Design a protein around this nucleic acid. Structure first.
Ligand SMILES: Nc1ncnc2c1ncn2[C@@H]1O[C@H](CSCC[C@H](N)C(=O)O)[C@@H](O)[C@H]1O
Ligand SMILES: [Zn+2]
Lengths: 86, 122, 114, 46, 107, 17, 216, 49, 204, 408
RNA sequence: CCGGCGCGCG
């Protein structure tokens, strides 16, 4: 949930999910309902940088629902999120 | 959390409600039920029947009616675990009565009134 | 379709089934200032970036303060005025800078105790 | 508001799930007021 | 009120009428919120910017808008001198994006 | 956050009348 | 001096009246006691008028439905329970319904005892399609809230639908002052000002007897 | 309290907002200068609140 | 499975959860007349017709019948993807359809219209079949009685059909309480059975 | 003292929208003999920015991707439906209206779809002004062989598509969508006359869509509109916004530019209507006689670049004349009046020859319209089109006369 | 207005 597809998804001759599209839970259930074996998504591992990240490779905002906004300090949030329950 | 749990904890049922094997007020609207509760006519968890004038939106088990009382004049009553539905073959009328308590009604009214008040204030 | 003018009125001709004690609640909402929270949420529905929204609001408030310094800082706040004006610019009427007072204060010197 | 009518129980898991669904449907401003009202109701019944 | 002699930061302690510390964990939270101007307030002219502390005292009494400090706080200048005592020079340079002129900031 | 991306003719010439 | 005033009034419909009232200046702790007593009096000590019993004549065979009437007997009773009345009656009186045939039966079709009025004449009772005369014998009572083949009606005597009180406190140093706010919602059979006055009178009548003395 | 409100002690509030209270005093001609306003604040006058 | 597409303008299309049931409809202003000689069952919204399975003798003459569905409500909380997605979804899962013959094929508008509860045909969605109801009559009178005073009771997932006098009608509260008492009594007996003094204990 | 001192639309029309989060601010829907329209229910005070007029949620629309592959938003077509096979066989470039018509029929057949109810307020076959419903008699009154040929080609294409895809062997779920040809023709006409194309972002996906937007197709067309459409992606809402700083009086119609820079012929081809103040209309002149562009603009107070002519008698007709009249410019060379008089006389002669080419005149066309009692909508549409062309030529003549008058 | 030591609170 919240990941951005890196490739188009097809069911037969029909496109059910396009490249550069946020993954809702309805789309995920549709993938599980049918026989979809491979899903290609954009993650922090796929971004073309280790000094910053882009909106599409990060995905949806953890708190604001929509796609993440430019200028967000996602690294500090990532560090705080893991160390907080320690 | 405890307050909400006690409020929405429903009726005592079965052997915890009747000493013997059995071989409730009807309210036009929720305001009448809460008013009766204020005047100490009913308890917080005493069962009651509430007239429903909206669509069927009560969360309940997906079960067929326990009993269908079909009259020779056409009207039939479908009795479920938590509501009663009156239907007819002559007309398109459909009456719904929900078996609930004052606590569930109070929770629903609290959330509904919060939404309506916020909408009206803006 | 022209006949003399007489014309056919368009009607629903179909059935759609989808067709009061909150006075204290609404008044309390207005008193505490939750309408401003709704307005702030509404203003951000048209902003791609919220940081840019905050920066623009701060710049507009700064311009307001520089232009008319003595009108702000008391019952009127520059940021509140900016937010009200931005809400008013959409056509939704709001009190100026969300400035409200208590009509039931029993004369000067009396301070409300929470 | 097209709210479902809960008729069984409201426990810790149910209230957490209900609030999350309210934020998605109504937003954070509406849900912030719903939380204020529900907090009073829970305190009043405890 | 009163500030430290060396760091020029507000004193510590209720008995000394000192201020509250904004530690590095508090700075992380502000960076997580993205409130870059709240952070700069508590880093320069509420703690140790001697020049900008005096102007904030004046602007707020007349209500005439607080400008950005743009200079270095006394904690950074204190660190530069200490690094100078280890035979190390630390210079802050601004490169103009217009004409690419290098500007040496006073530190 | 908020710090991202750096945050007279026609006069003295009127008709004499 | 201690004075009261109505600070808000509204009439959303004919059966929904709202009013907000004020009372100031008050001493510390007085406003809470007054509000509690007034709310209890408004909610249960005010007399209301309701239909408490219905008799179905014309031999309906005591069945669930009557031929020609769209609504069932239980539906008719539920509709009758919703009718808002006001009166000054002492004891119990009787009302009758006699509608000739097809059409809509509303509160307007009720023959009333002398002192009984009807707040809303548009309240629906039953719908008649075929021309059959319908005879219903209503029993009307006047009672407090806290108090033969004829079907009873579980009437709730609540002319005041809701009531609330709130306290505002003020002070400058050693002298304090508080203000009492009272909100009253009525079903139109009585105005919020009338409800306030009736509640005050009922409370005073409840506390008069403690000052009674007896002849020697 | 509301979800967006907090309660501040009177002493903490008067300490934190001292400059704003001085401006409010001077603006409505109730204080001659900054020193007089500070003296009024120190005396806990009823108009400071 | 048949090898032709029937015309649905002359058929009674009865839609259930698992299938759509077709019964030939003789023309009539009331549209309550059914011809059971020709029948077809299809998957929902599909024109691949098939002969339904029959578990009982079917009528040969045209009979006027009243249709009433049997099932449950599916009130679910669907996941919220888009803005303003519905908080709940309620749909009527019809699993059985009862066809009750009018007494002597009387019309609804007839002032003497009564329902014949001894003639009920049950359509099952799960099995894609149609059956006749096993009706048990308790009202005195036998074959000849006043049909205006009888009441039909359907229990056991639409399998138990019983005719009783209207006077002995059971309150909905009584039915719900009976079910609750039975289930809770069995549950309590199961819970207490694991105690080792259960055999020397009383219920009360 | 208080004591001493077009019809409203069906309330259910807005009510069905209102219960589904459709909001209209400061405007009311009105119905007339021509059709539906949106008018300001009060005086809209010009604010600093654009004002929100209406808000239509995304879930109430029927949108299809403008580019291959075809993906619908919201996805109403189930997987494996034959309607997808019918849609997917269309030509990607020119067959956009067929896909929208298929979607419209599918939605009309859907029980829970909103457009099943909203489709009852669409103009019927006898009320729609699209030329796809016009017969040969109505097309004969266009007095333009090019437009007539284009309309015949469009009708032939629509009927060929319907015949190819709605033959005998189609399943029942497809046959009931359009049992006979004119139903599909009406669907295509509605799609052509009410489709809105826009670049919308949904979530993280930005794409162009062909959209059937309820309550937004209600707005009428204008080349000087007071409203415009803005898509709000955060909550997926289409906003109708009045122009910033433009006062709107009570009862003033709400209008948007259906398509900019399109002449009356293309408007008649697509939306089935034309306007007399079209500032892009073209009259083919010989080009031998030319006037001074700068003087023509200055006399009538027409400023801005050739692509943004605007006025400070002068209307869009004068702008169209300035854009279509043969003009010469030499930076700062003034025109000598004598050649201007001869040039405008020759141009007026050409315009009068063009008017004489038409069998009838414009005033007689207006009289025929006023006396018309048993004609279809397309008949009056064609009559209005030719009359509007005649008035455009006449306005050109009058503008040339007054320009030669004010040259001294 | 500087640092060490001891005792505490969350
Ligand atoms: N300015 C205008 N003058 C005359 N007709 C117009 C017009 N703008 C749009 N139309 C017509 O309105 C249609 C667009 S849908 C607009 C509402 C429509 N009139 C109705 O009642 O449903 C087009 O087919 C076009 O023929
Ligand atoms: Zn990336």
């Amino acid at each position: 949930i919240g990941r951005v597809l890196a490739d188009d998804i097809y069911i037969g001759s029909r496109c059910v999910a396009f490249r550069n599209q946020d993954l809702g839970i309805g789309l995920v259930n549709r993938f599980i309902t049918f026989g979809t074996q491979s899903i290609s998504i954009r993650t922090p591992f796929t971004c073309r940088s280790t000094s910053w990240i882009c909106r599409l490779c990060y995905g949806r905002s953890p708190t604001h629902g929509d796609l993440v906004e430019l200028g967000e300090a996602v690294g500090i949030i990532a560090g705080q999120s893991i160390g907080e329950p320690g | 959390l405890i307050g909400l749990y006690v409020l929405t904890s429903g009726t005592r049922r079965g052997i915890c409600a009747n000493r013997y094997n059995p071989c409730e007020p009807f309210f036009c609207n929720s305001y009448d039920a809460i008013g009766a509760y204020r005047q100490k006519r009913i308890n917080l968890d005493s069962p009651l029947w509430l007239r429903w004038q909206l669509d069927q939106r009560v969360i309940a088990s997906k079960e067929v009616p326990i009993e269908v009382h079909y009259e020779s004049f056409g009207n039939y009553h479908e009795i479920y675990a938590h509501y009663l539905i009156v239907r007819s073959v002559k007309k398109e009328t459909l009456y719904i009565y929900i078996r609930t308590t004052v606590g569930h009604i109070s929770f629903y009214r609290e959330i509904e009134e919060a939404i309506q008040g916020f909408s009206q204030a803006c | 379709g022209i006949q003399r003018r007489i014309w056919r009125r368009r009607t629903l001709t179909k059935k759609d089934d989808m067709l009061p004690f909150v006075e204290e609640q609404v008044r309390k909402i207005k008193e505490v200032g939750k309408v401003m929270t709704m307005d702030i949420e509404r203003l951000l529905l048209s902003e791609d970036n919220r940081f840019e929204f905050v920066n623009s609001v701060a710049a507009e408030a700064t311009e307001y303060v520089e232009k008319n310094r003595d009108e702000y800082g008391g019952t009127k706040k520059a940021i509140f005025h900016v937010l009200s004006n931005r809400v008013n610019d959409l056509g939704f009427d709001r009190p100026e800078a969300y400035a409200e007072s208590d009509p039931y204060k029993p004369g000067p010197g009396y301070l409300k105790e929470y | 508001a097209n709210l479902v009518f809960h008729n069984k129980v409201i426990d810790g898991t149910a209230i957490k799930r209900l609030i999350s669904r309210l934020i998605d449907h109504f937003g954070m401003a509406y849900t912030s007021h719903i939380l204020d009202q529900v907090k009073t109701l829970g305190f009043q019944q405890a | 009120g009163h500030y430290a002699l060396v760091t020029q930061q507000p004193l510590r302690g209720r008995s000394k009428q000192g201020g509250q510390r904004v530690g590095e964990m508090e700075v992380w939270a502000l960076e997580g919120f993205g409130v870059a101007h709240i952070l700069q307030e508590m880093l320069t002219y509420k703690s140790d910017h001697i020049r900008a502390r005096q102007e904030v005292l004046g602007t707020t009494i007349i209500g005439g808008t607080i400008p950005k400090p743009e200079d270095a706080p006394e904690s950074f200048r204190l660190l530069v001198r200490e690094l100078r005592s280890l035979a190390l020079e630390l210079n802050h340079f601004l490169v103009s994006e217009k004409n690419f002129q290098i500007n040496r900031k006073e530190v | 956050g908020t710090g991202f991306n750096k945050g007279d003719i026609l006069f003295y010439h009127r008709e004499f009348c | 001096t201690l004075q009261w005033k109505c600070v808000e009034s509204r009439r959303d419909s004919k059966r929904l009246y709202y009013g907000r009232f004020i009372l100031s200046p008050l001493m510390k702790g007085q406003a809470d006691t007054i509000g509690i007593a007034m709310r209890r009096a408004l909610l249960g000590e005010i007399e209301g008028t309701c239909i408490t019993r219905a008799k179905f004549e014309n031999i309906p065979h005591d069945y669930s439905n009557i031929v020609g009437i769209q609504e069932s007997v239980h539906e008719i009773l539920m509709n009758l329970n919703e009718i808002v009345l006001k009166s000054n009656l002492y004891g119990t009186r009787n009302a009758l319904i006699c509608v000739q045939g097809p059409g809509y039966i509303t509160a307007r079709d009720i023959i009333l005892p002398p002192s009984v009025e009807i707040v809303d004449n548009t309240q629906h009772i039953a719908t008649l399609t075929e021309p059959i005369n319908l005879c219903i014998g209503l029993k009307i009572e006047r009672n407090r809230g806290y108090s033969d083949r004829s079907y009873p009606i579980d009437a709730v005597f609540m002319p005041v639908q809701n009531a609330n009180h709130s306290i505002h406190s003020y002070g400058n140093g050693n002298e304090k002052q508080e203000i009492l706010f009272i909100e009253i919602w009525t079903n139109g059979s009585l105005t919020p000002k009338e409800a306030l006055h009736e509640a005050s009178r009922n409370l005073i009548n409840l506390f008069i007897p403690f000052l009674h003395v007896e002849e020697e | 309290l509301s979800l967006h409100r907090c309660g501040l002690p009177r002493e903490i509030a008067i300490e934190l907002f001292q400059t704003f209270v001085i401006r409010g005093l001077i603006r409505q001609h109730l204080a001659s200068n900054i020193g007089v306003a500070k003296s009024q604040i120190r005396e806990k006058k009823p108009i400071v609140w | 499975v048949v090898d032709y597409r029937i015309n649905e303008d002359e058929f009674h299309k009865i839609s259930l959860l698992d299938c759509d049931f077709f019964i030939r409809k003789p023309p009539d202003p009331d549209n309550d007349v059914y011809d059971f000689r020709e029948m077809y069952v299809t998957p929902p919204d599909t024109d691949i017709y098939s002969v339904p399975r029959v578990l009982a003798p079917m009528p040969q003459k045209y009979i006027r019948c009243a249709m009433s569905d049997y099932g449950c409500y599916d009130v679910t909380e669907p996941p919220i993807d888009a803005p303003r997605d519905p908080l709940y979804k309620s749909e009527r899962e019809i699993s059985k359809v009862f066809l009750t013959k009018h007494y002597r094929n009387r019309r609804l508008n007839d002032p003497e219209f009564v329902l014949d509860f001894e003639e009920i045909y049950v359509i099952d969605s799960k099995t894609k079949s149609i059956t006749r109801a096993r009706v048990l009559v308790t009202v005195p009178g036998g074959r000849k009685r006043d049909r205006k005073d009888d009441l039909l009771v359907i229990r056991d997932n639409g399998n138990s059909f019983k005719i009783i006098h209207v006077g002995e009608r059971d309150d909905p509260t009584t039915v719900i309480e009976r079910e609750e008492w039975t289930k809770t009594r069995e549950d309590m007996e199961k819970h207490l059975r694991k105690l080792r003094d259960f055999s020397v204990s009383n219920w009360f | 003292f208080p004591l001493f001192q077009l019809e409203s639309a069906d309330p259910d029309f807005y009510k069905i929208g209102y219960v589904r989060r459709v909001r209209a601010y400061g405007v009311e829907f009105k119905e007339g003999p021509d059709g539906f329209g949106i008018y300001a229910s009060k005086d809209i005070e010009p604010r600093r920015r654009a004002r929100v007029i209406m808000e239509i949620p995304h879930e109430l629309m029927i949108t299809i991707r403008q580019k291959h592959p075809w993906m619908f938003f919201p996805d109403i077509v189930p997987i494996g439906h034959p309607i997808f096979d019918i849609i997917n066989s269309t030509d990607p470039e020119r067959d956009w209206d067929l896909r929208l018509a298929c979607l419209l029929l599918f939605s009309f057949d859907r029980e829970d779809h909103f457009w099943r109810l909203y489709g009852d307020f669409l103009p019927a076959a006898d009320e729609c002004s699209s030329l796809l419903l016009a017969t040969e008699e109505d097309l004969a009154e266009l007095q333009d062989p090019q437009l007539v040929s284009t309309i015949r080609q469009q009708q032939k294409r629509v009927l060929e598509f319907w015949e190819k895809n709605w033959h005998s062997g189609v399943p029942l779920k497809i046959k009931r969508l359009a049992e006979d040809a004119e139903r599909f023709i009406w669907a295509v006409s509605i799609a052509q006359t009410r489709c809105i194309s826009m670049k919308t972002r949904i979530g993280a996906l930005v794409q162009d869509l062909n959209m059937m937007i309820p309550y937004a197709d209600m707005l009428n067309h204008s080349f000087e509109p007071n409203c415009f459409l803005h898509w709000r992606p955060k909550d997926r809402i289409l906003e109708v916004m009045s122009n910033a700083g433009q006062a709107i009086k009570k009862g003033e119609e709400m209008t948007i530019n259906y398509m900019p820079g399109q002449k009356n012929n293309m408007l008649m081809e697509r939306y089935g209507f034309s306007t007399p103040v079209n500032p892009w209309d073209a009259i083919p002149f010989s080009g031998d006689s030319r006037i001074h562009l700068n003087s023509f603009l200055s006399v009538f107070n027409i400023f801005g670049l050739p692509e943004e002519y605007y006025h400070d008698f002068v209307d869009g007709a004068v702008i169209a004349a300035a854009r279509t009249l043969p003009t010469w410019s030499d930076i700062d060379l003034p025109p000598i009046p004598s050649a201007e008089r001869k040039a405008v006389k020759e141009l007026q002669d050409e315009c009068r020859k063009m008017l004489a080419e038409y069998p009838t005149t414009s005033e007689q066309d207006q009289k025929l319209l006023d006396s018309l009692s048993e004609a279809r909508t397309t008949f009056a549409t064609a009559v209005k089109y030719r009359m509007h062309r005649k008035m455009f030529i006449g306005k050109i003549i009058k503008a040339l006369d007054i320009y030669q008058e004010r040259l001294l």
